[PDB]
Design a protein around this nucleic acid. Structure first.
Ligand code: G2M
Ligand code: CL
Ligand code: CL
Ligand code: CL
Ligand code: MG
Ligand code: NA
Ligand code: NA
Ligand code: NA
Length: 326
DNA sequence: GTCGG
DNA sequence: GCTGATGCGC
DNA sequence: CCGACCGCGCATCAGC
């Protein structure tokens, strides 16, 4: 929050480029600048000082000078007045509605919360649930609640098969005091990069979590990735808890470290680490770290037995999860 | 929008 | 039905 | 300059 004013601006500009402009790289350009500045241990005095950080160029430098002087950005002042941009930004806040669908809904006259609600028929399944829990999904989850959720998920998984290992990742693993949702990495001895000795491994877990009324809805579900909704149980006479988004990723047991690296994030940290990797001649995904041949084709997986091994391959000193929140 | 070759 | 490309999300 | 910008699971559609 040291340069919160500036970081909020950039994030607003990022969201604009992504939602309205559908300009993915401009979106990432702004988020990275915001990330880099949020990490800067000094209260930025000028755009010149900002431009020294990597990710901040000449354009963002001008904007930062304007913000510091007026306390705002004209470009944003106008954007907030443009009804189309405002409508598109709003709609995109519903899970399942992206830049394209948002713009299309607007063309059709579907622009508000009320509109969406009276037009459920025009929404696929995911959007339908996103609208259903529109309010809850914007609420934060206190670490205390994440802890209760962790307990339920681990114990229920333990009941299905004592050999399952569920690891809560995301901002939780990074030590945050509150998370936007719950991310669960899951492994089972039967599922390795070598073979799937048992079917429905993920399905069985989902089923059990639904059986105890923890998982309440499903946005999407496949053999290895579940995207849905969950809710902590409330006590007698106690108001129930908000519904929460939950992601469960089944990953080959032998590829745990690359998997937990991926799922721990942050997303920008991942983007930065993978980029640095390429420069170092390696390619990283949630399954493996491979070398880049002369041509450019990925080689065979390199041996990995800890997250640190991955860091070593790219010549980066290890960074604990708590320090990966970029 | 920013960066590196 | 399939594969491949596009949305959307992590 | 100007090309690259991480990598992938699932839902959905076009074309066959
Ligand atoms: C701060 C959070 C948004 P929250 O607390 O508000 O939930 P989070 O938990 O950090 O991220 P979230 O739940 O969206 O995705 C989980 C992880 O998936 C990885 N991940 C997400 N997006 C990407 C991406 O674009 N690329 C890669 N490689 N990994 C990603 C890194 C992410 O950490
Ligand atoms: Cl772009
Ligand atoms: Cl691994
Ligand atoms: Cl791979
Ligand atoms: Mg999360
Ligand atoms: Na810079
Ligand atoms: Na959305
Ligand atoms: Na998530």
């Amino acid at each position: 929050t040291l340069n919160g004013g500036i970081t909020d601006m950039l994030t607003e500009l990022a969201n604009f480029e992504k939602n309205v402009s559908q300009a993915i790289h401009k979106y990432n350009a702004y988020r990275k600048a915001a990330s880099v500045i949020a990490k800067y241990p000094h209260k930025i005095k000028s755009g010149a000082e900002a431009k020294k950080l990597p990710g901040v160029g000449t354009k963002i430098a001008e904007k930062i000078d304007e913000f510091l002087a007026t306390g705002k950005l004209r470009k944003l002042e106008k954007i907030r007045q443009d009804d189309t941009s405002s409508s598109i930004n709003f709609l995109t806040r519903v899970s399942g509605i992206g830049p394209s669908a948002a713009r299309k809904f607007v063309d059709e006259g579907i622009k508000t919360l009320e509109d969406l609600r009276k037009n459920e028929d025009k929404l696929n399944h995911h959007q339908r649930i996103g609208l259903k829990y529109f309010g809850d999904f914007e609420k934060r989850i206190p670490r205390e609640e994440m802890l209760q959720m962790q307990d339920i998920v681990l114990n229920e998984v333990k009941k299905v098969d004592s050999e399952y290992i569920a690891t809560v990742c995301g901002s939780f693993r990074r030590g945050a005091e509150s998370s936007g949702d719950m991310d669960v990495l899951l492994t089972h001895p039967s599922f390795t990069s070598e073979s799937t000795k048992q079917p429905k491994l993920l399905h069985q877990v989902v089923e059990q979590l639904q059986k105890v009324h923890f998982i309440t809805d499903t946005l999407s579900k496949g053999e290895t990735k579940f995207m849905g909704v969950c809710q902590l149980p409330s006590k007698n006479d106690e108001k129930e808890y908000p519904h929460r988004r939950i992601d469960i990723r089944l990953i080959p047991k032998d590829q745990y470290y690359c998997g937990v690296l991926y799922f721990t994030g942050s997303d920008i940290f991942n983007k930065n680490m993978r980029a640095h990797a390429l420069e170092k001649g390696f390619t990283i995904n949630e399954y493996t770290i491979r070398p880049l041949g002369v041509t450019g084709v990925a080689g065979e997986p390199l041996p990995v037995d800890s997250e640190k091994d991955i860091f070593d391959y790219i010549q980066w000193k290890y960074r604990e999860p708590k320090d990966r929140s970029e």
